[PDB]
A and B are shown apart, each in its own frame.
With several copies, the nearest count.
Chain A
Amino acid sequence: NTISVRYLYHADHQALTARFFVPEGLVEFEAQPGALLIRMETGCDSPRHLYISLYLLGIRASNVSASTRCLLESVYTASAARAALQWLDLGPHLLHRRLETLGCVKTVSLGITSLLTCVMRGYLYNTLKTEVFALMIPKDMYLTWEETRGRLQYVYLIIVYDYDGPETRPGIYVLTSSIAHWQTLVDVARGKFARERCSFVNRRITRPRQIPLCTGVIQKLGWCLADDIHTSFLVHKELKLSVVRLDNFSVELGDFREFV
C-alpha cells in the first residue's frame, strides 16, 4: 500500500556504463554494440589518447587472413586509421602499454561526433532489459586451445610479439577457455608458442640493442557459456563479414599481465 517503493523504480542497472565521444571516422562497424573500446597512448599532446575499435587492430595484425585485410584496408580510410598507422605502427613491439581495454558498447549515437555508451563491467544490453546485445569477435582472431567446449569459458586477449623479421608484425588472439588459473595458462602457453619463445631468444642472438619483451600478455575480460558461443554473420557499409558472436557476455576487465 503506502510507500510502495517497488513501483517507483523501473529497473536497476548493475552495469557500469560510461559515455565516450568518438570521431565520425571510426564509427563504422563500431555502430554495432558488440565491440571492444581500446584507448591508445598517442605520443602527441593533441590528443594524447585516442580510442580505437578492436577491428582497427586487424589491419596490421599478422595472423588475420590477408583477404580480410584487403577488406579492412578499404574500410577505415579516414582521419582515424591514417593516424593510427602513423602512431601505433611506429611503436617498437609495444602495445600493452599503448593500449587499454575499456569494455564494449551499449549504444551508439550518430552525428558528426558519435558519442557512445560503453559498459566497463557487467552485462551489456539494450535499455529496459529488452534486446540483449552480444559481443562480436572478428572471425579469424577467435580460437580455442581446447577444441572441446567447456562448461564455462573465460575469454582472454593475448598479444603475441614476433621477432623474426626486422619489422615486427604482432598478432592478436581473442580466445575462450575454461581455464581460470594464470599459473597453468602460462604453462599451456609455453609449449604452444615455441616459435615465439624461440623468437624471444632469437632477438638476443642478433640484436643486443633494443630490449625484447613479452611473447604475450593475458588479462581477464569476462565469462561465457559454451552455448553462448556463436559464429554468425555481420553487415555494415555493405562490406559483409562473418564474426564470432558471444551472447550473454558479462564484462570483467582485469589488468594486463606481461610475461615471456
Chain B
Amino acid sequence: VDRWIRHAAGVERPQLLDTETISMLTFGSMSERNAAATVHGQKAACELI
C-alpha cells in the first residue's frame, strides 16, 4: 500500500538515497533536486486542515 501511495503521489523514493545522505539529514541537507527552467523564481506553499 505504501508503494501505491508513492505512485499516486508521484514522489518515488530515490532508492532511499545514499545511507550517508541520510546521515547528513540530521545535520540538515537539501533533498529537492533543482528544477531546470525556473523563469518564475522560488516557489513556496503550505497546508492546513
Binding site for B on A (CB under 8 A): 187-188, 190-192
Contact = CB atoms under 8 A, between A and B. Distances in A.
**Listed residue (A187, A191, A192) with the most chain B CB atoms within 10 angstroms of its CB:** A191
Contacts of A188: 20
Contacts of A187: 20, 23
Q: Is the interface of B mostly helix, strand, loop or mixed?
A: helix
A199 to B, nearest CB: 18
Interface residues of B, number: 5
Interface string B17-34: 011110100000000000
- Smallest CB-CB A-B distances: 7 pairs: A191-B19, A191-B18, A191-B20, A188-B20, A187-B20, A192-B18, A190-B19
Contacts of A191: 18-21
Nearest to A188: B20
Contacts of B19: 190-191
Contacts of B20: 187-188, 190-192
Nearest to A189: B20
A2 to B, nearest CB: 62
A179 to B, nearest CB: 11
Contacts of B21: 191
Nearest to B18: A191
11 contacts: A187-B20, A187-B23, A188-B20, A190-B19, A190-B20, A191-B18, A191-B19, A191-B20, A191-B21, A192-B18, A192-B20
B34 to A, nearest CB: 12
Contacts of B18: 191-192
A221 to B, nearest CB: 23
Contacts of A190: 19-20
Interface in B8-49: 18-21, 23
Given A188-B20, A190-B20, 9 more contacts: A187-B20, A187-B23, A190-B19, A191-B18, A191-B19, A191-B20, A191-B21, A192-B18, A192-B20
A33 to B, nearest CB: 36
A84 to B, nearest CB: 36
B26 to A, nearest CB: 13
Nearest to B22: A191
Nearest to A187: B20
Nearest to A191: B19
A119 to B, nearest CB: 34
A218 to B, nearest CB: 16
Nearest to B23: A187
A12 to B, nearest CB: 43
